[model samples]
Target chain A: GIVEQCCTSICSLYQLENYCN
Target chain B: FVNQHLCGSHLVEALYLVCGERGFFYTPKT
Candidate 1:
């Protein structure tokens, strides 16, 4: 999932639901 | 991917990008 986001530098995903909050 | 990451990452704007994902996991996951 995170792999396809290679171009999404502007999105800077904040892993709230997936990663440990 | 790009996860090692950098962006405007605050809170409000992050929500915007997240809400934009109406297409479903285009990420090709299991």
Candidate 2:
């Protein structure tokens, strides 16, 4: 889910969620 | 986009170019 959400934020220059987790 | 390649920043960099000006992922900046 973080991957998708990361991709989601990634589209906004803030997609480090999955990797950070 | 299953992240098969373990994903790289360059690819992520490329994603930005593709996602540019398109709200496919989320809302706009302005």
Candidate 3:
């Protein structure tokens, strides 16, 4: 669940164009 | 620059395949 959340969070960050941070 | 954007897309797709649906996607038809 934790890794899934991390992956999902990355997806969200990538969506917002804040992925680099 | 373009590679960065494409990389994001591919990473998302790869996660969905390897990391399960919890990997998630927000785009249409995904």
Candidate 4:
């Protein structure tokens, strides 16, 4: 089964680290 | 940025995850 949550943290971190890098 | 070690997140990661955005959010409901 696939799981899904808001994932906002992951998304924010992804965006943040993306911008930082 | 030297020796900054509250690591507050470690103490609260479990609790904090549930309370960000001041526990606020916009949820899309069905």
Query: For this target, which candidate reaches the highest lDDT against the unseen true structure?
Result: 3
What C-alpha lDDT do the candidate models reach, one value each? 0.36, 0.41, 0.45, 0.28
TM-score of each: 0.22, 0.27, 0.39, 0.20
State residue B23's C-alpha deviation in candidate 4, in Å.
Answer: 6.5
A1-21 per-residue lDDT for model 1 (tens digits):
443343343334555224212
TM-score attained by model 1: 0.22
lDDT string, candidate 3, A1-21, tens digits: 323334345555344332221
- Once model 2 is optimally superposed onto the true structure by TM-score, how far is the C-alpha of residue B28 displaced, in angstroms? 23
- Mark the regions of model 3 whose C-alpha exceeds 4 Å error after superposition: A1-21, B21-30
**What tens-digit string does per-residue lDDT give for candidate 1 at B1-30?**
433333223333444456465322332242
lDDT of 3 at B15: 51
Each candidate's clash count: 1, 0, 0, 0
The list of candidate 4 runs beyond 4 A from truth reads A1-21, B1-11, B23-30
Alpha-carbon shift of residue B30 in model 1 (angstroms): 33
lDDT by residue (tens digit), candidate 2, B1-30: 545234444445555565555424322221
The prediction achieving the highest DockQ against the true structure is 1
Q: Give the candidate number with the greatest TM-score.
A: 3
Q: What is the Cα-based TM-score of model 2?
A: 0.27
